[PDB]
Amino acid sequence: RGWIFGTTLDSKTQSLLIVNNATNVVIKVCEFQFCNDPFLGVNCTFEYVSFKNLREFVFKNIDGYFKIYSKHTPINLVRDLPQGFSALEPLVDLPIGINITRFQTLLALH
Amino acid sequence: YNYLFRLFRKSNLKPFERDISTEIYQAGSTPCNGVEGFNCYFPLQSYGF
Ligand SMILES: *[C@@H]1O[C@H](CO)[C@@H](O)[C@H](O)[C@H]1NC(C)=O
Ligand SMILES: *[C@@H]1O[C@H](CO)[C@@H](O)[C@H](O)[C@H]1NC(C)=O
């Protein structure tokens, strides 16, 4: 459902949070008390709001911009990445300004 | 003194990089352990306009 990017990931210095909640995407750059070990149930300076499914994403961080590209496709051979070619297309280009060196993903759990 | 600048850092900023961290700078041979001291300084300064 989303990702966390930064250096420490501890809110003593800045980190970028991205979350999808099926109705929206929500994006924040902040230093509040977030999760100790990130998951979801089944002190700010930027904010924004919008196995057959192979979903593909690309993330890169250049001159203070964080850039996202993506694609969705079915995969009839579901077992592993398919052998054919497809191209990802841009989503967003965010002026977030962070020195990102580490990242993590977010999962829905019982 | 309500305005400040950074005098010390581990390395230069990249273009449009930004940094509000308050870690003590080690200027020399003795480490700082999270406080000012011998060869150890807070990274910000004020103009005193
Ligand atoms: C609030 O943000 C500052 C950095 O701007 C950070 O030092 C502080 O730890 C943050 N608060 C919490 C609860 O982490
Ligand atoms: C998704 O997040 C937005 C912003 O907080 C909120 O308005 C919306 O109700 C959320 N959707 C659900 C299903 O909770």
Report the alpha-carbon distance of residue A4 to residue A103 in Å, rounded. Answer: 5
B16 vs A64: CB contact, 8 Å cut-off?
Answer: yes
Cα A44 to Cα A12, A28, A33, A88, A96: the distances in Å are 12, 8, 11, 31, 11
H-assigned helices in chain A: none
Token representation of residue A61: 């961080």
Chain A residues inside the 8 Å CB shell of B16: 63-65, 95, 97
Residue A24 burial by CB count (10 A; 0-12/13-18/19+): exposed, middle or buried? Answer: exposed
Query: What's the DSSP call for residue B24?
Result: P
State this model's resolution in angstroms: 2.8
CA distance A49 to B15: 26
Query: How far does the centroid of ligand 2 lie from the alpha carbon of residue A60, in Å?
Result: 27
**In contact, A102 and A34? CB cutoff 8 Å:** no
Sequence length of chain B is 49
Q: For atom 14 of ligand 2, which residue has the closest CA?
A: A21
Give A32's DSSP letter.
Answer: S
Cβ neighbors of B11 (< 8 A, separation 6 or more) are none
Say if CB A29 and CB A96 are below 8 A apart.
yes
Work out the angle at residue B46's Cα, subtended by the Cα atoms of residues B42 and B49, and round it to the nearest 5 degrees. 170
**A19, A20, A23, best to mutate for ligand 2 pocket (most atoms within 8 Å of CB):** A23
